[PDB]
Each structure stands twice: as C-alpha cells, then as structure tokens.
Design a protein around this motif. Structure first.
Motif, PDB file in Angstrom:
ATOM      1  N   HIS A  82      36.087  -1.710 -15.903  1.00 44.38           N
ATOM      2  CA  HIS A  82      36.189  -0.929 -14.530  1.00 44.38           C
ATOM      3  C   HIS A  82      36.451  -2.084 -12.968  1.00 44.38           C
ATOM      4  N   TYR A  92      31.580   4.903 -13.575  1.00 51.34           N
ATOM      5  CA  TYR A  92      32.447   3.683 -13.538  1.00 51.34           C
ATOM      6  C   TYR A  92      32.463   2.975 -14.772  1.00 51.34           C
ATOM      7  N   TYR A 227      39.746   9.505 -17.039  1.00 50.44           N
ATOM      8  CA  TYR A 227      39.847   8.117 -17.009  1.00 50.44           C
ATOM      9  C   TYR A 227      41.210   7.304 -17.619  1.00 50.44           C
ATOM     10  N   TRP A 230      43.711   5.498 -16.434  1.00 50.00           N
ATOM     11  CA  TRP A 230      43.085   3.599 -15.972  1.00 50.00           C
ATOM     12  C   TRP A 230      43.376   3.536 -17.578  1.00 50.00           C
TER      13      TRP A 230
END
Length: 237
Positions: A82, A92, A227, A230
């Motif tokens: 990340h 993270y 996430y 992401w």
C-alpha cells in the motif's frame, strides 16, 4: 498461533506459507490465495526485502517438513505494498504478491472469497486464525499449520484495550477477554477466515498485537473489506 490446534490437511486451502531464501530458507509470513496469481498478505511482512527474487510461496502445505530442496513452489514476480503504509500498528498493513506462475486450483489449494461492501454489516460468528506462528511469545515456527477459533470484537471494544494506539475502521480485532487464543510471531500475513453462509470469507489479515494471547489484548487484523477497491485497482495493473 497460541492456544490453537493442529489443522487437518486440506482444511485451509487458501492458506500459504511465504518463505525467504536469504540468508537461508525459512518461513517469513503467511498469506492467502485470492487469485490464480494473487496472494494477499501483510505489508510489514516485507521489511528488509529488496527483491522478490528471494521470495518463495508454498501452497497446499500442512507441515513445514514437506518443504525441502526438491519441493516445487511459486516464485514471486512482483511485491505490491500500500502507498499509504508505514507500519503495522499504523494500518494499511496489506500487500499483494503477483506470482510468476499460475496456481492450479485443487482440493489442496483454492482461493478464498473476498467480502464485499454489501456485507459490511454482516456479523461473522465463525472465525478462525491459522498459521505456523509461535505457540508462545518465546517459541519458534510451528511445523504443523495451527488453527484457532476467535471471536471478533467491536473496534470500540478493541480501541479500549489499546489506549496507546488508534484502532481505525480499517482495522479489525478478535480475541477473548481472558485471552488464551491469538495469532503470534510468524502468523503475520495470515488470513482471518470467517465462515458465513456455508462460505469462507477473508475477513482480516493477521497484522499485530501486544504480546500474544494476553488477556484484554485482542489481536489486530487488516479489515479486508475496506481494501476491496484497492485490490481490484492493483490486480488489473
């Protein structure tokens, strides 16, 4: 895993053991299979790692003794961390490993489902943490994949146990008020499987904790649902 039990071969097919070959081969962290060539794990598990050339992912493994010189494995092509990650305790703590080759799904190695922004209100009552981590703060890597059933705790309850940190909504904890069961050194990157509706969902990624299995010290995991976007962004190159 502290206070857990030896798993059954094939029980956690998405679980993988990340090894490092420098200076010598040894278990570094755990990981979860989420795609034919995608392993989800802990960013902080890559501290001191310059090239993925020294990384080796071993799937469908129960005991570490199965791993020798002649044991096939998956090389790592790329390590994706990340962009907003500084350290475990700061969240993270998540990273992706693009394998050099594709995993041939089977009973011994299959992907785990990723939660969706929809079940963001679902309450998992059946969660397990697995790994070859320590059995006690001062132990060693376990040969047989250990497992342990741990209850989730509200971030509010968690924050209450870590008055020195900031338990963000991007973190999820789990533990017994009196302790006893928890992840430990070696389990990082490990998956926090939760069965819901006859299906296992990767809820958290073993990240950190104060000591191991201490009373009023739930374990901290990366809240994977936060996430999904992401992961999609980074898996499509």
């Amino acid at each position: 895993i502290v206070g857990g039990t030896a798993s059954v071969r094939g029980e956690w097919p998405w679980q993988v053991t990340l090894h490092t070959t420098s200076p010598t081969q040894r278990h570094l962290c755990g990981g979860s299979i989420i795609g034919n060539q995608w392993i989800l794990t802990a960013a902080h598990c890559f501290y001191g790692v310059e090239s993925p050339k020294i990384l080796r992912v071993y799937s469908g493994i129960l005991n570490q003794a199965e791993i020798k010189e002649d044991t096939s494995f998956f090389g790592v092509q790329e390590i994706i961390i990340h962009d907003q990650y500084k350290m475990a305790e700061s969240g993270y703590d998540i990273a992706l490993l693009k394998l050099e080759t594709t995993v041939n799904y089977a009973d011994s190695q299959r992907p785990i489902c990723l939660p969706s922004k929809g079940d963001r209100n679902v309450i998992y009552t059946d969660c397990w943490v697995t790994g070859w981590g320590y059995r006690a703060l001062r132990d060693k890597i376990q040969n047989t994949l250990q497992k342990a059933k741990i209850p989730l705790v509200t971030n509010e309850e968690c924050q209450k146990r870590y008055r020195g940190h900031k338990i963000t909504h991007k973190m999820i904890c789990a533990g017994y008020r009196e302790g006893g069961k928890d992840a430990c050194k070696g389990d990082s990157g490990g998956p926090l499987s939760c069965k819901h509706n006859e299906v296992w969902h990767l809820v958290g990624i073993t990240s950190w904790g104060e000591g191991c299995a201490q009373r009023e010290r739930p374990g901290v995991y990366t809240n994977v649902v936060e996430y999904v976007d992401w992961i999609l962004e980074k898996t499509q190159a």
